[PDB]
């Protein structure tokens, strides 16, 4: 029939698959990220650590150009000193966990580059809107 | 004069009115949704239940096309097996509490339909942006 349990995977379902098939379904890891007298305080400090580290990822996402769009292009070019890999491989050769080792030095340079490339784009949108 | 207390209602003000007059003022139920040694823990588990179930509604809203727009069209058609009602009535005949009984079986089918209709629209926006 229509609707089967084969290609409709679950949480962390495509965790070994290639990036071109992991970016097909990103919402399944997205929605299970917030919901799911001293052992009540083990409940409190487990809950306010979940809603805190969710908001921290929604803030670093927020101050770039991506409010809730969940996939978004940007303006910074890709300097080959970061990864030096071909484009035609890294969407069907590697997998995401193999990528996260391959780049982990160069984050906080990209995250610093993204904020300035947004705030430069933000006021330049205003200067276009101000003259007209 | 200008500015009267008649049509400027309060919290849950239009709760019996029709949908065409309840969607006139939706912000009044919106803004009173977050703000307003053992009975301090009755304060803590009342606060982190308020900010948690607010973020849960802001996440289900977020992964559809509606970041903070508070009224937004979408792309899924309205199958008449859900409601089978006329359009010309349900904005001036019924009221919202009469609607919530009339549809409550068919939620989590609509909420599942909305995520796939966004993520299909999300990557197709990228494939339009990638070729040019």
């Amino acid at each position: 029939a229509v609707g089967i349990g084969a290609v409709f995977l679950g949480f962390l379902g495509a965790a070994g698959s290639t990036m071109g098939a992991a970016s097909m379904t990103l919402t399944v890891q997205a929605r299970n990220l917030l919901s799911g007298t001293v052992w009540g305080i083990k409940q409190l400090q487990a809950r306010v650590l979940a809603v805190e580290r969710y908001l921290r990822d929604q803030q670093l996402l927020g101050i770039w150009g991506c409010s809730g769009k969940l996939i978004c292009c940007t303006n910074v070019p890709w300097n080959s000193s970061w990864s030096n890999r071909n484009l035609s491989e890294i969407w069907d050769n590697m997998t995401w966990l193999q990528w996260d080792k391959e780049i982990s030095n160069y984050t906080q340079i990209i995250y610093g580059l993204l904020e300035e490339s947004q705030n430069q784009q933000e006021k330049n949108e205003q200067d276009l809107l101000a003259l007209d | 004069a200008v500015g009267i207390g008649a049509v400027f209602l309060g919290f849950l003000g239009a709760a019996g009115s029709t949908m065409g007059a309840a969607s006139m003022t939706l912000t009044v139920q919106a803004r009173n949704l977050l703000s307003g040694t053992v009975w301090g823990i009755k304060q803590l588990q009342a606060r982190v239940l308020a900010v948690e179930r607010y973020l849960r509604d802001q996440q289900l809203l977020g992964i559809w096309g509606c970041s903070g727009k508070l009224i937004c069209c979408t792309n899924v058609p309205w199958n008449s097996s859900w409601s089978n009602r006329n359009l010309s009535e349900i904005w001036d005949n019924m009221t919202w509490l009469q609607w919530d009984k009339e549809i409550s079986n068919y939620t989590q089918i609509i909420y599942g339909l909305l995520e796939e209709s966004q993520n299909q629209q999300e990557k197709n926006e990228q494939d339009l942006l990638a070729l040019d």
């Epitope: 229509v2 609707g3 089967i4 349990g5 084969a6 409709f8 | 989590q108 796939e116």
Partner: antibody, heavy 123, light 112 residues
Framework: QVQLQESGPGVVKPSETLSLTCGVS??????????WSWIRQPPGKGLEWIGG????????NYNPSLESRVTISKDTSQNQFALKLTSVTAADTAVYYC??????????????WGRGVLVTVSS | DIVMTQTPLSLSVTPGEPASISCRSS???????????VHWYLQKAGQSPQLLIY???NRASGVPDRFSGSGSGTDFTLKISRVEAEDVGVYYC?????????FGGGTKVEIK
């Protein structure tokens, strides 16, 4: 409308291999978001899933009772869906349904079912 | 393997009286995406099986209210409300929640 015709030997010998082809008329087998499957059914004894294939990832699946002997391949040169089953036994006497299943309602809301070829093993 | 048992074996139903065919899985069939992956099929003898009820308590695009789907986790009932002459055949319960797909043993309904 994709019409699925099936072909194969009606008399299959013991201890040899069985080869069944599923002709794809009115369309291509490489059409996206469809699940191509073989389904057997003994007469009046219930349906049984043999195996399947999703086109977009080239993922062949089988029945865990029957992973060992079934090899499923795609014949793009003749637009056919292929089944090869070695050491065929008496419990494989069944009618073979070739089923194309849409995984999403954007691809289709009602799947198609083949005419079915009854294959009985004898000498 | 998960077991799909069908009750009863065969029913001789009168045209008009509500008929019920039940099938029970080995575990619950509710998935996190929001759909219950339990299905029901109609088969005539000498005819390929056709889907009747997908995503139960919702009708398909072409079947009337003569068929119905209800139940909960591990308990599934197919209800035939109004019986016609074409209602005869063998019905099958089948899960599309997990791999593999397992089918029912078959429930024959005949005419009196």
């Amino acid at each position: 409308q994709v019409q699925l015709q099936e072909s194969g030997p009606g008399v299959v010998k013991p201890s040899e291999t069985l080869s069944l082809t599923c002709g794809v008329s009115g369309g291509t087998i490489s059409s996206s978001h469809f699940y191509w499957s073989w389904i057997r059914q003994p007469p009046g004894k219930g349906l049984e899933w043999i195996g399947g294939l999703y086109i977009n990832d080239e993922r062949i699946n089988y029945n865990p009772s029957l992973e060992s002997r079934v090899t499923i391949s795609k014949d793009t040169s003749q637009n056919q869906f292929a089944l090869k089953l070695t050491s065929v036994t008496a419990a494989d006497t069944a009618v073979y349904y070739c089923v194309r299943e849409p995984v999403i309602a954007a691809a289709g809301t009602v799947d198609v079912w083949g005419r079915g070829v009854l294959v009985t093993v004898s000498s | 393997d998960i077991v799909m048992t069908q009750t009863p074996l065969s029913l001789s139903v009168t045209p008009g009286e509500p008929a019920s065919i039940s099938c029970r899985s080995s575990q619950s069939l509710l998935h996190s995406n929001g759909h219950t992956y339990v299905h029901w099929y109609l088969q005539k003898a000498g005819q390929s099986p056709q889907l009747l009820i997908y995503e139960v308590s919702n009708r398909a695009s072409g079947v009337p209210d003569r068929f119905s789907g209800s139940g909960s986790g591990t308990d599934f009932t197919l209800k035939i409300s109004r019986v016609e002459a074409e209602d005869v055949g063998v019905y099958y319960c089948e899960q599309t929640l997990q791999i593999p797909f397992t089918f029912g043993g078959g429930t024959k309904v005949e005419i009196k």
